[PDB]
């Protein structure tokens, strides 16, 4: 759980950092996953 807590903490931080300035990458705002 503390290991799981470590995972969650680092993954949440990861997502936050990688999400920074996402406003500059909105060309596919309606299709995040791409298309068939």
């Amino acid at each position: 759980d503390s290991m799981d807590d470590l995972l969650i903490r680092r993954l949440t931080d990861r997502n936050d950092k990688e999400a920074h300035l996402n406003e500059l990458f909105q060309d596919n705002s309606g299709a995040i996953g791409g298309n068939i």
Partner: protein, 269 residues
């Protein structure tokens, strides 16, 4: 818990700057045409964005849609058949009025001499799905000892599985992936890679038995370190993983969307 962790991985996402080499465009076409600024999940393939790319440059192409197409990063060929997050980790290295922008720069290129080991971007709209499902078939076999679980899915169940990757339907993905295997692994589907950015890149898929054992990353140091090593940081899903971490836990929680657990080795000093 597991699902909360998997939800974080599913929500994983990167800023990606795609540039279309002029070789594809008509001399004189607008700047905006050769550039796309998108958000791409860590758990997907770059090739899932070809439709988006083609639709934007169609009217300005420099040819009638025998050259090959592939992606590049800083003039270096980058394989589309690895999850985007895994490609990112390999390029990021220890990285795991002024601001730090975290983004992935990708360039679409063409040519006649296809680069070594690079699988070209196909016109066949099932290229990714076919490759991806084949990844899961191997995974099922590695985890269960047989591929029976995945072969028993209905045709539409399998399509729905791939479909969740495009639509980002977490519930469907979790539903099917768990069905393929929810028991304790006979072997661990593990791929180990170094950097495509620095040094001589290498990748391996060591056989690791799990029957009756519960190894930690340190326990399999023999598969991770090389002969010369007999100063390495383990990066999985963009984060640092401690050596005492249990391999079963790591796999069951941090494996990528193709069923394989990927670790990236980066020098500490």
């Amino acid at each position: 818990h597991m699902n909360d962790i998997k939800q974080l991985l599913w929500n994983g996402e990167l800023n990606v700057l795609v540039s279309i080499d002029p070789s594809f465009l008509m001399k004189g076409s607008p700047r905006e045409i050769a550039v796309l600024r998108i958000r791409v999940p860590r758990e997907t393939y770059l090739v899932n964005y070809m439709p988006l790319i083609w639709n934007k440059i169609k009217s300005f192409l420099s040819f009638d849609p025998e050259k090959y197409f592939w992606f590049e990063h800083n003039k270096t060929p980058i394989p589309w058949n690895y999850p985007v997050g895994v490609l990112f980790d390999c390029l990021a290295g220890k990285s795991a009025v002024k601001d730090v922008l975290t983004f992935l720069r990708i360039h679409l290129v063409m040519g006649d001499s296809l680069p070594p080991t690079i699988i070209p971007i196909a016109s066949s709209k099932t290229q990714a799905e076919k490759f991806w499902f084949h990844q899961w078939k191997q995974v099922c076999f590695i985890l269960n000892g047989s591929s029976k679980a995945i072969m028993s899915l209905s045709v539409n169940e399998a399509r729905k599985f791939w479909g969740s990757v495009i639509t980002r339907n977490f519930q469907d993905f979790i539903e099917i992936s768990n069905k393929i295997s929810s028991s304790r692994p006979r072997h661990i589907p593990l791929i180990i890679q170094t950097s495509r950015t620095s040094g001589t890149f290498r990748i391996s898929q060591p056989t690791i038995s799990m029957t009756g054992v519960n190894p930690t990353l340190k326990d399999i140091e023999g598969d991770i370190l090389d002969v010369k090593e007999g100063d390495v940081m383990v990066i999985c899903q963009g984060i640092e993983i401690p050596w005492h971490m249990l391999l079963y836990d790591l796999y069951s929680k941090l494996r990528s969307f193709d069923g394989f657990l990927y670790i990236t080795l980066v020098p500490i000093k």
